[PDB]
Amino acid sequence: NGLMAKRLRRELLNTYEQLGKSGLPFLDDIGKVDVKFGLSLQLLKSIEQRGMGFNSIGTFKAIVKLSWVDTILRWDPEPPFDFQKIEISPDEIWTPDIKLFNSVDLDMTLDRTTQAIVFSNGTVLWIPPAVLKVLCVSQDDVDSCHFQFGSWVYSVDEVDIHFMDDKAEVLLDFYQDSLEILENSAQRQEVVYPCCESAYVEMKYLLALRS
Amino acid sequence: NGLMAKRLRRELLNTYEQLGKSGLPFLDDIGKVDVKFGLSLQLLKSIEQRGMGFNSIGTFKAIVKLSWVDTILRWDPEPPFDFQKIEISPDEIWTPDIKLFNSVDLDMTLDRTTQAIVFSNGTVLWIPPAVLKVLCVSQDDVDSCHFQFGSWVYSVDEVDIHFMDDKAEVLLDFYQDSLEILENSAQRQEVVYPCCESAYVEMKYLLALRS
Amino acid sequence: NGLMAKRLRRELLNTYEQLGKSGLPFLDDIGKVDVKFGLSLQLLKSIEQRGMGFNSIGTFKAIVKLSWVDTILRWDPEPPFDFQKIEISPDEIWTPDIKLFNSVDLDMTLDRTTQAIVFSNGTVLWIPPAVLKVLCVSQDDVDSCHFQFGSWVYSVDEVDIHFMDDKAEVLLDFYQDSLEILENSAQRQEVVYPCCESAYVEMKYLLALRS
Amino acid sequence: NGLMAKRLRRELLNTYEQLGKSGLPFLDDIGKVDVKFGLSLQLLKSIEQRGMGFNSIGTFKAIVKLSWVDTILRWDPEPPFDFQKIEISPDEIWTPDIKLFNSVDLDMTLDRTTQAIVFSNGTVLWIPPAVLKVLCVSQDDVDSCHFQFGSWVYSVDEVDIHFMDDKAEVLLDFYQDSLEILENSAQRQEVVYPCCESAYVEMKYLLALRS
Amino acid sequence: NGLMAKRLRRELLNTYEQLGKSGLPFLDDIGKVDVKFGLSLQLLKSIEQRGMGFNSIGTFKAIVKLSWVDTILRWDPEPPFDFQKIEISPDEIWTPDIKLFNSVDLDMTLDRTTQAIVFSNGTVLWIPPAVLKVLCVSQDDVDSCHFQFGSWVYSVDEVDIHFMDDKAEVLLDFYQDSLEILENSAQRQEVVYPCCESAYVEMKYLLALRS
Ligand SMILES: *[C@@H]1O[C@H](CO)[C@@H](O[C@@H]2O[C@H](CO)[C@@H](O)[C@H](O)[C@H]2NC(C)=O)[C@H](O)[C@H]1NC(C)=O
Ligand SMILES: *[C@@H]1O[C@H](CO)[C@@H](O[C@@H]2O[C@H](CO)[C@@H](O)[C@H](O)[C@H]2NC(C)=O)[C@H](O)[C@H]1NC(C)=O
Ligand SMILES: OCC[C@H]1C[C@@H]1c1cncc(OC[C@@H]2CCN2)c1
Ligand SMILES: OCC[C@H]1C[C@@H]1c1cncc(OC[C@@H]2CCN2)c1
Ligand SMILES: OCC[C@H]1C[C@@H]1c1cncc(OC[C@@H]2CCN2)c1
Ligand SMILES: OCC[C@H]1C[C@@H]1c1cncc(OC[C@@H]2CCN2)c1
Ligand SMILES: OCC[C@H]1C[C@@H]1c1cncc(OC[C@@H]2CCN2)c1
Ligand SMILES: *[C@@H]1O[C@H](CO)[C@@H](O)[C@H](O)[C@H]1NC(C)=O
Ligand SMILES: *[C@@H]1O[C@H](CO)[C@@H](O)[C@H](O)[C@H]1NC(C)=O
Ligand SMILES: *[C@@H]1O[C@H](CO)[C@@H](O)[C@H](O)[C@H]1NC(C)=O
């Protein structure tokens, strides 16, 4: 039923509307969120040399694939709110504060008009299109670019990240370009800071393209 | 009478103000939304070579024509609400999440200040101007460009798309440029992905222009 | 008295706050809106060749002058509401949905922080600065540009447009540039479309400039 | 006391929250606002030739200094509200609709996150940073640029403007550039328009720089 | 407990919600806010010569680190509010109006989507990424740039600023560029203004890079 589906959304989102979206998505014991992160390359927009040196600015279009469990967005799918999945705006719920650290701008831009899909068991899946602008090295007909992602404020004991389907590389399921990928690897690291306290989880991708 | 027109709109939008705009537009049994889609080209803004390769970024001006039925927005066209149609802002109703997938930016931009028209039988007509920026091949005095459109999170079970007026082509009813058109064809496909389960309707246009 | 003037505005705008700003500005019998339209050129920002052909993109600074009657905004100018006119934001009332159809971008941009003035008889005068970007033909040291304006959704029986002061030309009352104007003509047309039924009013300007 | 300072602000702003920010800032008899206006040049971002002619677009960074009396924002500075001044957001109060008339863009951009200061007598001081883009004449190694400011809708009987400290010149208290200034002049004018009936006050600046 | 954390946030923010974010963060006796400021360079986006002179515009990506005590955001960390710290959006609490004075645009842009952390003793820590655009001198293969920061409206008796960790220099804990740093120093100044009354705290950084 269509009414129940909307009443169900209002039901789940009501917590977030009354207490806000800030803070880890647990009402009971505060646990650890495990984010599944995937990066699917679509195309290169431009590679522009910085000055007359061997660095350059690479602008890419990609799809950022995110998944996590939100304890607050749970229901039992039995009459009449008997659905396995529901569509929700990412601006109406908690979302990981995942940033592109080495962004040449403030951050990557994600299309937040892109809806997320919430399952009965609380598993959120959010797959926004994305624009990424980073500093590359352009030397000997090769453009090598790094991409660095992680939660800004949450440590490993609060937000953790692992590669989707444990593939430590740029995914090519959405690839639509003609460029030759010379190199494609990634890495999960736990990094400590002179500014802060604990370890933080960062996914570091390395991409190299034939120029 | 202008009061009744406004009262009508308010009473129709009551449901959306209470339950939100997310989710398929049905209150009773949840069906399948069928969107009629039309791409009307107006003009080329620019075509810029990417680096010194054979690809380029094409930036276009177009009119995107969309129609579908919204069961929630139905009335009895008899006094004092004898109106055939009513004008609505698309930010007050559900709209299909149709994106330009091969967008070199986050997505195409639609002018969402453009008003939609809704008839008494729940048929919605929305015709927003649009800006489209896609990757083209520029070779042999011809520029070939592709436009890929589809609902982002909805499968063919939920949102289906068909060419408006069975015309599988870029429409030229708003054409205002001086460029020579060499190829113009489109295709409705059903696509599966490794991220997802079911089939997704994508509309793929091919446009080639004399450089 | 300043309070009363503020309270008048509140009483006038109460209808729009409660009923919405969509729909023609009549609360009794629904009539036709007659819009007076004036385009006053201020200056040329740039004219840039598109590729290596005869076409170019011209970006203009202008003042768009608009006047219409809003029945909802009328009042009897007797104490304590003895004001001949009042200033209001155009985001708080109905405004005609007039677009620059042949814009190379989504549309022209009007400055909507610019206040409108409303007279006690309901006449609205709104004169927002505007940026317009169109395709031009640059050939033989002459740049020829067109501007095409119209209500997007309302036909001639709903929203009519006429040149302000019956001057079928780009107005030069705000002109402050050094360019030599070589041609300056305009025409009001009633245009029929494929997608739609009735006739739509379009104001079409031709402006030629010494390159 | 910190608490009382916030209560006072809430109490002062209550009038604008109920009645709105539109309209001259008087609750008793409507008088004349006399805006004190200063333009303080910081630096030149760029001067770029338009086409191959003698005009160019000058983009400047400046501080716009504004001051006026808002009789609605007055209080008596004795306990528990014994403050000589209070900080307020300019988007919470009436501000003069002062535009850069000869902007090449829609208008100058003022930074409206910048707080204003109100003294207990109702005098408002607001000093936002600003970006200004205008037509210049670039000839004989001199760049001559004009700046024209005024209230868009209010005549001299409603909003007057005078040079801050009666300095008819671009002010150099914030000047941080290395450019040679060759002429720095200004004039306050009462201008009569055809669209309108009374006189409007315009501040006109001439600034010439060594190219 | 997760719910208890959200309720704590709602309790802390109620003051700001009922009373507003404007004004120094004290509910009792108004005192001085002492801000710790750190500037961490990440990379150079670009440096573009202005005209054909010895100046240029440098565009930098950095991390701005701010810390200060907000007396309003204090709680006793005993059950059931036994949390040492909580994340809060910076648009929900007072933040110092610290500006990049010598910005070539309106201001530096800070990523305000970035959450701040508040500890139970009222200490706020906020570390937004930032883009900074300033005037530089490009001479003898050296690009020398200045950065000037301070509170816009608050004097030394209201908002003070000191170098975070007493490091009077640009910090390199986030530095991801390949550029050679020639000069790196900074200085806390107390500056009296002619437009105004008291003394203002400004942080002035000097950075020279190899071209
Ligand atoms: C308020 O609480 C904060 C958070 O603990 C204190 O910040 C600490 O500062 C000390 C001195 O440098 C550091 O050694 C600690 O590591 C900091 N704490 C953390 C967890 O980051 C701050 O000092 C406290 N202020 C007081 C004492 O009132
Ligand atoms: C409202 O109060 C303010 C503050 O007292 C007055 O502004 C000051 O005026 C004195 C004397 O003219 C000057 O020396 C100061 O420079 C002013 N302070 C600032 C920073 O503006 C103001 O004149 C009063 N307004 C009126 C209309 O009397
Ligand atoms: O340790 C006390 C507070 C801790 C949570 C702090 C924080 C706030 N903002 C940014 C932070 O950066 C952590 C690393 C750097 C990028 N992730 C930490
Ligand atoms: O497979 C189960 C969930 C299904 C709804 C999912 C989804 C969420 N976000 C984006 C999606 O993309 C679908 C196709 C690929 C691009 N459109 C799917
Ligand atoms: O008769 C069917 C509805 C009619 C009102 C429709 C409509 C909606 N959006 C845009 C429209 O365009 C009309 C002309 C072309 C641009 N103005 C029409
Ligand atoms: O004649 C009475 C109306 C008067 C207030 C009108 C108005 C509205 N919008 C813009 C206006 O321009 C006035 C001059 C030109 C720019 N300042 C006037
Ligand atoms: O002196 C009385 C008022 C004082 C608070 C004023 C103010 C308002 N806006 C900006 C200001 O600038 C102060 C210096 C210049 C940059 N910081 C001051
Ligand atoms: C929740 O549902 C999704 C898809 O239905 C499934 O992949 C996921 O494992 C489920 N969560 C659990 C652990 O039951
Ligand atoms: C609803 O109305 C429009 C125009 O009145 C028409 O084109 C459409 O087919 C109608 N739908 C049905 C099923 O009657
Ligand atoms: C309404 O009043 C104004 C001010 O006198 C006048 O100029 C305008 O023409 C009037 N409108 C009509 C439609 O008569």
- Are C191 and C148 a contacting pair, CB within 8 Å? no
Q: Widest CA span of chain A, in angstroms? A: 66
The CA distance from B75 to E49, in Å, is 64
Ligand 5 pocket, C192 CB below 6 A? no
Pick from A23, A28, A195: CB nearest E65: A195
Q: Which residues are B183's β-sheet partners?
A: B208
* Angle formed at CA E207 by CA E201 and CA E210, multiple of 5 degrees: 175
SS3 at position C78: coil
CA C165 to each of CA B154, C66, C191, E141: distance values in angstroms, whole numbers, following the listed order? 52, 11, 22, 62
- Are D45 and D179 a contacting pair, CB within 8 Å? no
Ordered DSSP codes for E189-210? EEEE-SSSSSEEEEEEEEEEEE
The number of folded domains in chain D is 1
Atom of ligand 1 nearest to the CA of A196: 21
- C-alpha C116 to ligand 5 mean position (Å): 27
> Residue B158 has which token pair?
């939920």
Closest approach of A103 to chain E, Cα-based (Å): 8
The CA distance from B88 to B13, in Å, is 9
The CA distance from E56 to E49, in Å, is 4
Give the residue among C157, C136, C158 at the shortest CA–CA distance from C206. C136
Phi, psi of B136 (to 5 degrees): -115, 160
Phi, psi of B11 (to 5 degrees): -65, -35
**Radius of gyration (C-alpha) of chain E in whole angstroms:** 19
Q: Which residue is associated with the tokens 């020579």?
A: B180
Q: Which residue is associated with the tokens 């079970």?
A: B157
Q: String of b and e for B117-132 (b: at least 16 CB within 10 Å)? A: bbbbebbbbbbbbbbb
Ligand 10 pocket, C119 CB below 6 A? yes
SS3 at position D6: helix
Phi, psi of D171 (to 5 degrees): -85, 150
Give residue B195's identity as a one-letter amino acid code.
Answer: C
Asked if E59 has any chain A CB less than 8 Å from its own CB, the reply is no
Closest approach of C206 to chain D, Cα-based (Å): 21
SS3 at position A98: strand
Report resolution (Å) to 1 decimal: 2.2
The CA distance from E124 to E116, in Å, is 7
- C-alpha C151 to ligand 5 mean position (Å): 9
Pick from A22, A25, A105: CB nearest E9: A22
Spell out which residues of chain C touch residue D55, defining contact as CB-CB under 8 Å.
177-178
Q: Whose CA is nearest to atom 13 of ligand 8?
A: A121
Q: Are C50 and B44 inside 8 Å of each other by CB?
A: yes
Spell out which residues of chain B touch residue A60, defining contact as CB-CB under 8 Å.
none
Experimental determination technique? X-ray
Q: Are C23 and B42 inside 8 Å of each other by CB?
A: no
Q: Are E102 and D6 inside 8 Å of each other by CB?
A: no
Q: Are E30 and D88 inside 8 Å of each other by CB?
A: no
- C-alpha A123 to ligand 8 mean position (Å): 7
Pick from E88, E117, E178: CB nearest A55: E178
- Are A66 and A35 a contacting pair, CB within 8 Å? yes
Ordered DSSP codes for B163-208? EGGG--S-B-TT----PPEEEEEEEEEEE--SS-SS-EEEEEEEEE
| Omega before B80 within 30 of 0, i.e. cis | yes
The CA distance from B160 to B170, in Å, is 19
SS3 at position D32: coil
**At what angle are helices E2-19 and A2-19 packed, to 10 degrees?**
70
Q: Are D97 and C115 inside 8 Å of each other by CB?
A: yes
Ligand 7 pocket, D125 CB below 6 A? yes
Ligand 3 pocket, E98 CB below 6 A? no
Phi, psi of C64 (to 5 degrees): -95, 120
- Are A25 and A105 a contacting pair, CB within 8 Å? no
Chain D residue nearest residue E58, CA to CA: D45
Closest ligand to C-alpha of residue D84 is: 2
SS3 at position C108: coil
CA E120 to each of CA C93, E66, E69, E80, E87: distance values in angstroms, whole numbers, following the listed order? 47, 17, 10, 13, 11
> Residue A59 has which token pair?
């602008």
CA D119 to each of CA D6, D83, E117: distance values in angstroms, whole numbers, following the listed order? 15, 8, 34
- Are E55 and D178 a contacting pair, CB within 8 Å? yes
Spell out which residues of chain B touch residue C28, defining contact as CB-CB under 8 Å.
1-3
Chain B residue nearest residue C50, CA to CA: B46
Spell out which residues of chain D touch residue C115, defining contact as CB-CB under 8 Å.
22, 97, 152-153
- Are D168 and D149 a contacting pair, CB within 8 Å? no
Closest approach of A194 to chain E, Cα-based (Å): 7
SS3 at position A10: helix
- C-alpha B101 to ligand 7 mean position (Å): 49
Closest ligand to C-alpha of residue D40 is: 7
Sequence-distant (6+) residues with CB within 8 A of D127 are D63, D64, D65, D66, D114, E152, E195
The CA distance from B16 to B26, in Å, is 11
The CA distance from A34 to E52, in Å, is 54
Helix (H) or strand (E) holding B2: helix B2-19
N residues, chain E = 211
- Are A71 and A120 a contacting pair, CB within 8 Å? no
The CA distance from A94 to D165, in Å, is 52
- Are A41 and A167 a contacting pair, CB within 8 Å? no
Chain D residue nearest residue C44, CA to CA: D104
CA B19, B24, B30, B33 torsion-angle sign: positive
- Are E55 and E143 a contacting pair, CB within 8 Å? no
Chain A residue nearest residue B29, CA to CA: A1
Q: Are B24 and A43 inside 8 Å of each other by CB?
A: no
**At what angle are helices C2-19 and D2-19 packed, to 10 degrees?**
70
Asked if A197 has any chain E CB less than 8 Å from its own CB, the reply is no
Ligand 5 pocket, C152 CB below 6 A? yes
The CA distance from A209 to A195, in Å, is 34
> Residue B70 has which token pair?
């919204």
To test the pocket of ligand 3, the residue of A24, A195, A200, A202 to mutate (highest count of ligand atoms within 8 Å of its CB) is: A195
Domain range for residue A129? Answer: 1-211
CA B196, B199, B205, B206 torsion-angle sign: positive
Q: What is the CATH number of the domain that holds C5?
A: 2.70.170.10
Atom of ligand 7 nearest to the CA of E196: 1
Q: Are E1 and A50 inside 8 Å of each other by CB?
A: no
